[PDB]
Amino acid sequence: VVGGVV
Ligand SMILES: O=C(O)C(F)(F)C(F)(F)F
Ligand SMILES: O=C(O)C(F)(F)C(F)(F)F
């Protein structure tokens, strides 16, 4: 699982 936020 992976996530990213800008
Ligand atoms: O996404 C993975 O690698 C996984 F192991 F299935 C999790 F359980 F972390 F979701
Ligand atoms: O990106 C990588 O090299 C990895 F090892 F999968 C981490 F777990 F750090 F995400």
CSV table of N, CA and C and ligand atoms in Angstrom, one decimal:
chain,number,residue,atom,x,y,z
A,1,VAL,N,0.9,-1.2,0.0
A,1,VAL,CA,0.0,0.0,0.0
A,1,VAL,C,0.9,1.2,0.0
A,2,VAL,N,0.4,2.3,-0.6
A,2,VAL,CA,1.3,3.5,-0.7
A,2,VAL,C,0.4,4.7,-0.8
A,3,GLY,N,0.9,5.9,-0.3
A,3,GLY,CA,0.1,7.1,-0.4
A,3,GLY,C,1.1,8.3,-0.5
A,4,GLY,N,0.6,9.4,-1.0
A,4,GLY,CA,1.3,10.6,-1.2
A,4,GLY,C,0.5,11.8,-1.1
A,5,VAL,N,1.0,12.8,-0.6
A,5,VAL,CA,0.3,14.1,-0.4
A,5,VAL,C,1.2,15.2,-0.8
A,6,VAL,N,0.6,16.2,-1.6
A,6,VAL,CA,1.3,17.4,-1.9
A,6,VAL,C,0.5,18.5,-1.3
B,1,LIG,O1,0.0,-3.7,0.3
B,1,LIG,C1,0.6,-4.7,0.7
B,1,LIG,O2,1.8,-4.9,0.4
B,1,LIG,C2,0.0,-5.6,1.7
B,1,LIG,F1,1.0,-6.4,2.3
B,1,LIG,F2,-1.0,-6.4,1.1
B,1,LIG,C3,-0.7,-4.9,2.8
B,1,LIG,F3,-1.2,-5.8,3.7
B,1,LIG,F4,0.2,-4.1,3.3
B,1,LIG,F5,-1.8,-4.2,2.3
B,2,LIG,O1,10.8,2.3,-1.4
B,2,LIG,C1,11.4,1.3,-0.9
B,2,LIG,O2,12.6,1.1,-1.3
B,2,LIG,C2,10.8,0.4,0.1
B,2,LIG,F1,11.8,-0.3,0.7
B,2,LIG,F2,9.8,-0.4,-0.5
B,2,LIG,C3,10.1,1.1,1.2
B,2,LIG,F3,9.6,0.2,2.0
B,2,LIG,F4,11.0,2.0,1.7
B,2,LIG,F5,9.0,1.8,0.7
